[PDB]
Amino acid sequence: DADLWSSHDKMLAQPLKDSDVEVYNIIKKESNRQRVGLELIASENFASRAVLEALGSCLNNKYSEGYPGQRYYGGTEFIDELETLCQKRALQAYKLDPQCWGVNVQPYSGSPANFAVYTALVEPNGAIMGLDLPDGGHLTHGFMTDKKKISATSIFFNSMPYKVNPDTGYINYDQLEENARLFHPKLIIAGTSCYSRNLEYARLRKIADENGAYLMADMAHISGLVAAGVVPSPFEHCHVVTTTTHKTLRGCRAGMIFYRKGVKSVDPKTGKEILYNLESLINSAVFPGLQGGPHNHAIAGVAVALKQAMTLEFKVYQHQVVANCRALSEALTELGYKIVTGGSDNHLILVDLRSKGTDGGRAEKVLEACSIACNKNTCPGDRSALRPSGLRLGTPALTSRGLLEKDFQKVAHFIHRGIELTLQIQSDTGVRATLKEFKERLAGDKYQAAVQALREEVESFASLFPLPGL
Amino acid sequence: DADLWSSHDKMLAQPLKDSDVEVYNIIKKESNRQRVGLELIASENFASRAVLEALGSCLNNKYSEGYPGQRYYGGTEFIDELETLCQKRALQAYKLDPQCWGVNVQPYSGSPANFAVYTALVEPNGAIMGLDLPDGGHLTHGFMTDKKKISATSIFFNSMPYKVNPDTGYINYDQLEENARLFHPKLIIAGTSCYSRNLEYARLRKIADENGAYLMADMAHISGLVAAGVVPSPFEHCHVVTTTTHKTLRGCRAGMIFYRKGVKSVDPKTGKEILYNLESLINSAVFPGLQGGPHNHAIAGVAVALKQAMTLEFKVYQHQVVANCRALSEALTELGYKIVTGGSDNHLILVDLRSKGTDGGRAEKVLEACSIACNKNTCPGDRSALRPSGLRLGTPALTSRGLLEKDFQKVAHFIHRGIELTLQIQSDTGVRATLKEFKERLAGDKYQAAVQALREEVESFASLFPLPGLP
Amino acid sequence: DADLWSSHDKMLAQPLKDSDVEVYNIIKKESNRQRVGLELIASENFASRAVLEALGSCLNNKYSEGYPGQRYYGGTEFIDELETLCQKRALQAYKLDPQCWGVNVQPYSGSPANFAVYTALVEPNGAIMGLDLPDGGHLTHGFMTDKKKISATSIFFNSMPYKVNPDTGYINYDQLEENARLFHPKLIIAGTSCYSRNLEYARLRKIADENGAYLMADMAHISGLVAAGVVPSPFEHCHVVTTTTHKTLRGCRAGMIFYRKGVKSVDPKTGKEILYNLESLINSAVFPGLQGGPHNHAIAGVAVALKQAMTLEFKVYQHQVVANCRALSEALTELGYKIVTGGSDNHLILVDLRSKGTDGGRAEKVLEACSIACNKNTCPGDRSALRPSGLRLGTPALTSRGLLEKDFQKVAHFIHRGIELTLQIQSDTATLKEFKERLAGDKYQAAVQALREEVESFASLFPLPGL
Amino acid sequence: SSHDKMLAQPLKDSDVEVYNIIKKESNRQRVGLELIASENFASRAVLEALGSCLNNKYSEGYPGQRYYGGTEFIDELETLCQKRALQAYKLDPQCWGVNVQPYSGSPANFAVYTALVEPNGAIMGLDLPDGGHLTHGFMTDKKKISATSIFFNSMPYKVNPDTGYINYDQLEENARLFHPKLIIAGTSCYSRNLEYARLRKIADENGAYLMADMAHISGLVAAGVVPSPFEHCHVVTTTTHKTLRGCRAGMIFYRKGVKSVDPKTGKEILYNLESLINSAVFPGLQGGPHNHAIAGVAVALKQAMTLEFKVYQHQVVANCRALSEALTELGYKIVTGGSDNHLILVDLRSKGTDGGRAEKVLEACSIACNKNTCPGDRSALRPSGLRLGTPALTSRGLLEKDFQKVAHFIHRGIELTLQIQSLKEFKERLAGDKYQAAVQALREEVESFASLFPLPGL
Ligand SMILES: *Cc1c(COP(=O)(O)O)cnc(C)c1O
Ligand SMILES: *Cc1c(COP(=O)(O)O)cnc(C)c1O
Ligand SMILES: *Cc1c(COP(=O)(O)O)cnc(C)c1O
Ligand SMILES: *Cc1c(COP(=O)(O)O)cnc(C)c1O
Ligand SMILES: [Cl-]
């Protein structure tokens, strides 16, 4: 009668360690894996303990549909404080005048953030233009084939990508300007998932204005860098700025949408000023358009992250991020590796392994087997996305642990050694060998000691640094 | 040189309490606010500590785009174990045969989960039919006006709602079957945000098959009940079942999508069997269609919740949820309140305040001022959505704290006293008064003591019960 | 060198009779077929010789893209007179104040005319409501199935039809009003292909305004009647009126689009009167949106037809059209045939053959074999559009030849005899394939011939407009 | 009583007002020099067919698939027409089919899109200012103007402003990005032959359809004066007037039979254009066919298979050269100096003026032609070129020597234009009193020359 009811009350108060050992262990194993591993995936990073604590707060429970002042349900005086605070810090972090800029912090993640904007400004079967996927774009910028639309962006809207110049490795802004005149985009996307150089926002803006389109920036990857002022801000030229709250920003998984406010343009003769209406449209698209109940526990984490983002320690961190990157870049350069575009203005670099006579697809799996985390990526000029020639390497992940130039140079050597091992297996399994067979020879018995020998040395090195979290 | 670099390392390992007192205090205030208040919002509930500890895990860091064995990035052997485990438990919680059913657990929340399905199955400007918003539907089921499409569902797809019978209060399935033949839906939604009775899924399935459409169930609200077997399962008749992982399920904020697998139909003559292709379509729609990197930390929280959901304590909980609702319902009934449809087969009820001579819009604000959390809602027969007559009251939130029949009856009294105070203020401020003026008189000095008197008594009563997941 | 160049000049000036005997013969055969046949298809009629002469004019050559004074090419002073005249007459025919009403006369036909309006006013994937197809609607009013969108209207625009009350036979305006509040139509269509009663335009207007939609009337089938004032005008309540120039109007194949002009409403507070903008939108949609170079030769025929439509002879014609319809109706009623809705306010009627124990699909083919031209059509309450129960019978065609009440009663008898032959064939034998076969059979051929010859010999007694 | 007379009364009596307008136009066409490429004079045989009782018969559907009965004679007609259509272009009935119901050329194209591309699908065509046609797609930074652009996705390909030739290289490049479903090989104002083989290669590479719009060259291709697009294209749309000298109507030719085969399984995949395209015309877009037009078309198709027509089409091309070089030698700059077809595009910047002004002056002199933007024009509001075609006049009996005398009459108009020039104000000065005698003096001399030739029709 009341024996089991007490057990119920005990259940909701019971610690994870006891309640779910099965899941508890998986988290422990992952925590370990992250610790002994070298993280070089550009989109990776380690959240602060302060942010993680906010995610476990009672803020999960409160359903606060709508916005501060326009709430559907009542009893939100504290959620209002939080959401209002978060967006106040968001504007501060990027030095934005509240009268010139507004921000929406409800987006569940980065992808939903972008889609909300399209839905709001472009509208069904509208025209969008973004960096091609194999050229360093992101799916949310549109992606389709001769057979079908794959990305949601491509499905409901009409996309046609602009490309990078295969020779220089830089974005071909000239061709974009030309195609834009024939396609008449409604919105142009200024952002990249795998691009190692600063975007010419001023140039793009002009191209957008020429065609009467919006300029949306997706600073997902460089959000941390722009905040610290380590890289040129896109806010000066863009109309809308979408961003993820994780990656270089080191927040929890969430998204944000910055939009212009105030005067859009004026009539020379009548003096009648036309004001921006992005605030209304964008907000309406997030709710009640797409999303429902805001994830207040995440908004908190974001708010916490934004405070840390405005500290000097962060500013230093972001500079060290870039500094490390050049160290890693030149270290590999001097080793004979062809960096795409000959260096990086930001945190990441794209290594074209054709320089060593191999591809990223095979190098990826080998590096992984050695606790070296990174991802393959197609290089400018690749005639096949199935066999990518390059590897994407970012520094923000390791930098957060305390890695410095000298260390990233030691990492560079570990990476090379992985490529080496790759070239051995590649030559051993023949030339007409498939990726299927390569994976088998790798996990094979012949190279089992070699892989382990490196892995153990990589792990022992990573173990020397702290792992933010706990 | 190295003085500030050490401070950097200290910052990432620094506790929230020290790192951000400003946010830390807001959380404490909220945590205190939830404690002393009676939560009666149907969609509300309290997550278990175990779940809350999973969200703060290092799982936040790993980017695992794709699905188990189909991952874009490497080093996911532990994320795979987690995602594979979660979805295995998901199928178990609802006693589903893995050969007959599959599930995607990546959706960031409920809404994204629904939109994912439409994208995959219905496709741009396809026809969708759902319960009307003011009749207890949800925005994601579609909503528009004579002037614009408001819901993303309506914006990108061609939607037309089906309505509840204003007299009885039950969904008018007959009109639906009729309009369906005209509209030719490609998919019909069997779900509600504010409905107090069990859906006739069998009926709906027939109507769907007649027009060659899919039947998608949105068990967001009754997900918990269905799991414990307290309410008839929609899995028997529907093709797809979307759900939120919170509310009655008591998980963290996230969504799931269940889809049919195996044989769809067979040719009587040729014997050639056609198989379902929902798995591929739905999965492709979630990724790389709509979402990006899975929120693994939430996927863990869902997994944890799903294990608790399969326990006997949960089963008892859910039974107590419904039991409490009947107690609250009949308690208000006996006080003369008109419950829409005269009761409820589930956790929530819809109280029509026209019975006491007022509206939900005003009662909402008064009850709130007294720490009585609930939301207004239009009743069947309301000629104006600006002045809703009804209140939505749910029991899952309080029942989680430990409330029982007898307690919910006491709550029923406290609520009544709230309606009373509402009636006094309503008559005091006149009849032609606006909601604007009402709010002012409420917060006014004349009723400042009355409100406080009730508030303090409610909070003192609310304090007697525990609150899940603290320090 | 110049021997064949002379032949070329001879070719262009050579008569059809000589230039293309093959085609010349087909025309003669058809002309004959029409002469000896009894035309009872509601959408049919016979154009005046005057109109037919206009179609062969040199107006075929001029390319006059755009509108009067807004032409893309020059040298259109005479085309401008024509088009301007035509639309001037169009407004007169329906007693429409030019300040309150405008009209576009370029549409190649009725369907394009309708689509032109949707593209202009409704816009891609915009809601549209019309009478359901099997209930007497038209394809252009929207039509779809579970499998697919079939009509262009349905493919590009959201369409959801309203239905006729299966019991009474009248349109169910109540259900429309109800579904309208859910669907939120941008444009409602008040027109019918197979409907025997006057539309409650006032009622429909109220429903349209309630949902802030446009009321578009498709008077294709009643354009002639409304012109003569035999039937209540849709112009008093509608925002836009589309119409074909043939059928009851006895013009050549073409379409027109009438639209409201002037003040739409006057805002209460501001007081700034808001004006209609249909003229621009609709015109823009016809060109340069949808169509290209106008078919001035048809625009002439239309103009000619419109002048004839304003004569007393025409007025008497249309009255006689309705008169004949009543006679035909009651003549079949008295023979026991069930007329859907029990009569007709206009030119056509729907005969429910279930009263005789058969279907339209089986009666159509028999009647055809007897030179009796008519078409099958689903009755209200038909559970299968594959086996339609009714026949659609119209008077405008024969009436033009000179047929009168007494004659249409003799026609009624001829029709009944066709139904008998149908029933007798139906009794012996089954799928339609088997039926058609039995009809072409060895024993009913005579009975049929006995009828055909008698029908033809009767039709042969009346003049055939054209030549 | 009197009503029976009315339906049998002649137009001359029934409607004098309309009757006169027709006479005035017939006169105007007789005394004017028609040089609009899209113009032509239909034979008297075709015109008589348009007035036939065929106007009355509603024959919805296709032969053997009709909705209404009593169509045995319409079936013969429509079947004959499409039989002749295939003969005219030497097309094997097993390899090719044709739909002859389209009310005009524009509807013909749209039908194809509706059938193959499917709503919000991607098509590509020559840019409008580069000599494309509206139906091939046309939009701006502000709105979609052409029906094609509205319901579908269009992204045009351009002509090389330097050479004047279509830039196939850039098309091949952009195509890889836009993923067209259908590419359009057709022009309204393009002076050279299309590289269909090339286009086909580009289409196959992207897995698209190759639709040819031979509206302007339909007559030329029929006679074999110009390379046929049927050898490389999947679908061929066309108008039945213009160079074909039929009444206003359209046709749609489509491939039939085997599309491709599987090397291993030997399983052959067959084309399905016939069904889709037909279904799109009806019951998709159109309603009751215009049988009176279908007859005229059939008549024209017979004339198109005669030797007299063949000669005509060659004289058409021949005249064009004579006119091209006659203006070349007078110092005028022809874009792509030389034409492989009936029309040419005269760039008036070589004479220090624009087409927009020359058009209005030439018109005032009974010289019919139209302005058109040249490759390299930075403003479509001030077009630099004039489009001049020979099929119209050639049909009257005009020969090389005559078109040279025409070339002189045209030049004199350009002079008169340059005098007035040294657009609103220009029009006023033209109609002004100062140049009233000069215009009349040339007009009377132009008209007196045209009067010397016969006018097909009556
Ligand atoms: C709550 C709910 C959802 C999901 O809402 P989110 O706040 O986006 O998780 C979906 N459907 C229904 C019927 C609901 O009640
Ligand atoms: C990572 C990323 C996003 C957001 O990804 P989520 O996993 O959905 O948070 C958005 N845009 C770009 C360019 C990105 O690289
Ligand atoms: C006949 C008809 C049309 C037009 O038909 P066409 O054969 O295309 O001229 C349009 N609407 C209605 C209601 C009709 O009956
Ligand atoms: C003229 C033309 C058409 C058809 O024009 P209509 O005015 O509709 O007869 C079609 N395509 C092209 C390329 C043309 O030049
Ligand atoms: Cl990424």
Ligand SMILES: [Cl-]
């Ligand atoms: Cl809700």
Ligand SMILES: [Cl-]
């Ligand atoms: Cl009809």
Ligand SMILES: [Cl-]
């Ligand atoms: Cl043209």
